[PDB]
Design a protein around this motif. Sequence first.
Motif, PDB file in Angstrom:
ATOM      1  N   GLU A   1       0.651  -1.161   0.032  1.00 61.22           N
ATOM      2  CA  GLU A   1       0.042  -0.105  -0.081  1.00 61.22           C
ATOM      3  C   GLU A   1       0.978   1.075   0.057  1.00 61.22           C
ATOM      4  O   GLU A   1       0.525   2.171  -0.807  1.00 61.22           O
TER       5      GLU A   1
ATOM      6  N   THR B   1      -2.691  11.081 -11.643  1.00 59.47           N
ATOM      7  CA  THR B   1      -1.860  10.290 -12.590  1.00 59.47           C
ATOM      8  C   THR B   1      -2.068  10.676 -14.031  1.00 59.47           C
ATOM      9  O   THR B   1      -1.367  10.374 -15.005  1.00 59.47           O
TER      10      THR B   1
ATOM     11  N   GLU C   1      -4.602  -1.609  -8.911  1.00 53.08           N
ATOM     12  CA  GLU C   1      -4.085  -0.621  -9.961  1.00 53.08           C
ATOM     13  C   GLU C   1      -4.502   0.014 -10.875  1.00 53.08           C
ATOM     14  O   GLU C   1      -4.311   1.346 -11.423  1.00 53.08           O
ATOM     15  N   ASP C   2      -5.535  -0.635 -11.527  1.00 58.53           N
ATOM     16  CA  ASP C   2      -6.371  -0.337 -12.495  1.00 58.53           C
ATOM     17  C   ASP C   2      -7.204   0.966 -12.575  1.00 58.53           C
ATOM     18  O   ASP C   2      -7.397   1.835 -13.193  1.00 58.53           O
TER      19      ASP C   2
ATOM     20  N   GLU D   1      -4.984   4.080 -11.563  1.00 55.28           N
ATOM     21  CA  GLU D   1      -4.303   4.583 -12.714  1.00 55.28           C
ATOM     22  C   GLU D   1      -5.151   5.650 -13.830  1.00 55.28           C
ATOM     23  O   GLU D   1      -4.613   6.253 -14.394  1.00 55.28           O
TER      24      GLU D   1
ATOM     25  N   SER E   1     -10.175   0.032  -3.014  1.00 52.99           N
ATOM     26  CA  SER E   1     -10.229  -1.463  -2.828  1.00 52.99           C
ATOM     27  C   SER E   1     -11.847  -1.787  -2.344  1.00 52.99           C
ATOM     28  O   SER E   1     -12.451  -2.730  -2.662  1.00 52.99           O
TER      29      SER E   1
ATOM     30  N   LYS F   1      -7.980  -5.301 -10.993  1.00 50.97           N
ATOM     31  CA  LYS F   1      -6.936  -4.888 -10.040  1.00 50.97           C
ATOM     32  C   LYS F   1      -7.159  -3.660  -9.306  1.00 50.97           C
ATOM     33  O   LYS F   1      -7.593  -2.777  -9.905  1.00 50.97           O
TER      34      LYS F   1
ATOM     35  N   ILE G   1      -6.277   4.333  -0.933  1.00 48.84           N
ATOM     36  CA  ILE G   1      -6.311   3.059  -1.334  1.00 48.84           C
ATOM     37  C   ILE G   1      -7.351   2.274  -0.799  1.00 48.84           C
ATOM     38  O   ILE G   1      -8.029   1.346  -1.410  1.00 48.84           O
TER      39      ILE G   1
ATOM     40  N   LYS H   1       3.960   1.360  -0.983  1.00 49.88           N
ATOM     41  CA  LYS H   1       4.486   1.263  -2.375  1.00 49.88           C
ATOM     42  C   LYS H   1       3.508   1.763  -3.335  1.00 49.88           C
ATOM     43  O   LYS H   1       3.876   2.526  -4.636  1.00 49.88           O
ATOM     44  N   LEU H   2       2.206   1.406  -3.356  1.00 56.90           N
ATOM     45  CA  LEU H   2       1.169   1.941  -4.161  1.00 56.90           C
ATOM     46  C   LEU H   2       0.931   3.484  -4.050  1.00 56.90           C
ATOM     47  O   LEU H   2       0.920   4.301  -5.218  1.00 56.90           O
TER      48      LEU H   2
ATOM     49  N   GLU I   1       4.047   5.385  -5.879  1.00 54.76           N
ATOM     50  CA  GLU I   1       3.950   5.338  -7.455  1.00 54.76           C
ATOM     51  C   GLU I   1       2.886   6.207  -7.923  1.00 54.76           C
ATOM     52  O   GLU I   1       2.767   6.461  -9.013  1.00 54.76           O
ATOM     53  N   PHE I   2       2.055   6.564  -7.151  1.00 48.35           N
ATOM     54  CA  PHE I   2       0.855   7.351  -7.615  1.00 48.35           C
ATOM     55  C   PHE I   2       0.503   8.706  -6.864  1.00 48.35           C
ATOM     56  O   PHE I   2      -0.434   9.320  -7.062  1.00 48.35           O
TER      57      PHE I   2
END
Lengths: 144, 184, 134, 57
Positions: B26, B110, B101-102, B105, B45, B99, B41, B28-29, B32-33
């Motif tokens: 999480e 982003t 990540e989709d 994104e 989810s 997922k 997050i 890490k997520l 990246e975003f």
Amino acid sequence: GKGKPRGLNSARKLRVHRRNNRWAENNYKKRLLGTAFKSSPFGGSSHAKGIVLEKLGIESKQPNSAIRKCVRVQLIKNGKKVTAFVPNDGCLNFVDENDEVLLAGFGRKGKAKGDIPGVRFKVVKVSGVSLLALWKEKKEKPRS
Amino acid sequence: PRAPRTYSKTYSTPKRPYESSRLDAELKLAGEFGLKNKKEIYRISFQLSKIRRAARDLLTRDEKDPKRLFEGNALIRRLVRVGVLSEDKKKLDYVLALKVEDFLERRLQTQVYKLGLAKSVHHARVLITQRHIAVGKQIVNIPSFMVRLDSEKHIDFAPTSPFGGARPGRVARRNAARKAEASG
Amino acid sequence: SDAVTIRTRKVISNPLLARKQFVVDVLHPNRANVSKDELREKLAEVYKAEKDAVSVFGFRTQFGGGKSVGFGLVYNSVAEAKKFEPTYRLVRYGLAEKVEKASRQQRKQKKNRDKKIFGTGKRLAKKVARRNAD
Amino acid sequence: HGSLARAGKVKSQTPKVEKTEKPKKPKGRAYKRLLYTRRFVNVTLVNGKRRMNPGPS
RNA sequence: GGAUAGUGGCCUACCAUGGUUUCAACGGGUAACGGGGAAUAAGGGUUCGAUUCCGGAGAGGGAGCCUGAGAAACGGCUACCACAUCCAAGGAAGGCAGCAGGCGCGCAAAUUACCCAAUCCUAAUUCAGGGAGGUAGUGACAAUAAAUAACGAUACAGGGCCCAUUCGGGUCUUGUAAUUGGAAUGAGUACAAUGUAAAUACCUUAACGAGGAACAAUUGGAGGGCAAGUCUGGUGCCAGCAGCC
């Protein structure tokens, strides 16, 4: 046939059998007897206020050796006399005598928190001021 | 009394708090975003849970059932519209495999990062919040926008922002006074 | 007065109240928002129905400026808007100056006091005056 | 008996060590970025333990 | 038969022991108004539901009644019980489980504010009234993204690459740097338009705020469960910690 009846018309027996056997559960029995309402010193409430009657030197239960600092408290709403722990270091000097305190349980649902014998409650406020505030010097008790 | 205003939660906390594998992923997520919370997050989810629950119940029904023929198509159109799942499918497949990540994104944080106007997810997030972005003709400052695939070609800088003329910005306006004050 | 581009939408003919009902949306780039003394007479010249027979309200500014949308309406005459337009809008636009009035607390208290009095009350003042000596 | 004393002992014998001045850490997504670039972009030592707050040895 | 608007042991004039009951009658308890619903869920369940809607009941406790189409009405009356107010003491006046507010109670809960502008109700269906209702005030329980800084240069540590004095430089950056600069916007300060007739609270301004306490973020924890220190001083079965060990 596994004991219990299985017939399509045996719903009453299964119902009555379950009803009788739920009494062996401690929580169901305590709830439906109303023990907290009728026997517990808070009367079933989370908190209670009371007046400090005396400073206590409850010794620790084995194998630990210590003097837990507690206060006899007579609850305002009941008149029941309970023992409340004064948790943090030196907070006994904030809860000295005759003041109005707020008490909460120990989290054990009516048992002993640790090696402290017989004590169910703890102090959380003194004279309207949170004990954590006095311990962290954030607030001070009214001098006059 | 007036009829109650309904409200509903949008996120769900995980059952086990201190999971090393989940905690690392999480955070890490978020890096990246460029997200500020774990709740950012948790909601995705939670949003995914309502979607997998919807498709799971629909897929238990038989083929050519009017319920999934209508509700499954509606869910497909909504998910294709927001771009979470690929548009070259007609088989109600990707939905249960979507997922986390989709979803994030497709967020505007982003979305404007990869469209070249932001140069970073953190720069975009600050850019988003400071209102230097218009999705259609309208200025937004929502990091979680869910661009509807008709607005990726519609993105642009806000006309009411610097680099748009007649608007240099407050710090620039102070330097404008400094330009005259320097000589004087 | 520069690129205000005020226009009306959903114009429906409502003759029972004898007016034209519509929503009005303005585009005001590089502008905070247009006021009543501007929008009312601008709506008047575009419609050529009357001058004070125009009414506008609502007028929420779009998030981040640029444009604004609200509601508008035009009457056949000023003498016909006097019979229909709400009082608070008439007072706000300047078509009427409301005289100062007692507050709700004071108005209700006065009604409580004179409900305590039966009759007109002229004779009560005399009896109290005649009995005030002793 | 004698319990009406000796309470609050160690809190009264602890030497006062004042807090050291430091700058504020980033807060929010900025702090989230700090942990992200502390955990995953530094690959100096991820062999066996990946120590988080290791003390001097 | 009487009474009732009307059925009916509803009440009044008789036999038969008629009626109910382990398929739980009848008693007792309920920190019991019922339901639509709520929380929690693999599936079944368990717990809750004073409370925005519906139905019931009540107006301090009982009882009785007038008027009226409709009340056994309580911001209608009558009486007793409890409480309780104003009396030059002979008398008179009641009733916030409406609103605001006050006292008590407790762990526990807001303004004695503005209005009928909206919703709708009432009347003599055609300018009134409405603490119903709305609006604002208090309100960090409950919920919804939501700011607490973003970008560029500038000394080497080396997830790696061109050439071989493999430490002879690199469009290539991951960061210690209390080294800067060209940045950007918000918290928000109304005689300015947009809503309540008196005003408030996202926008934009003859006008404003940001370079460190600046205009910082707290609450908990770092033996295990359960991610995070055999780091440093102090105490030394003491103080204290410790939901459990």
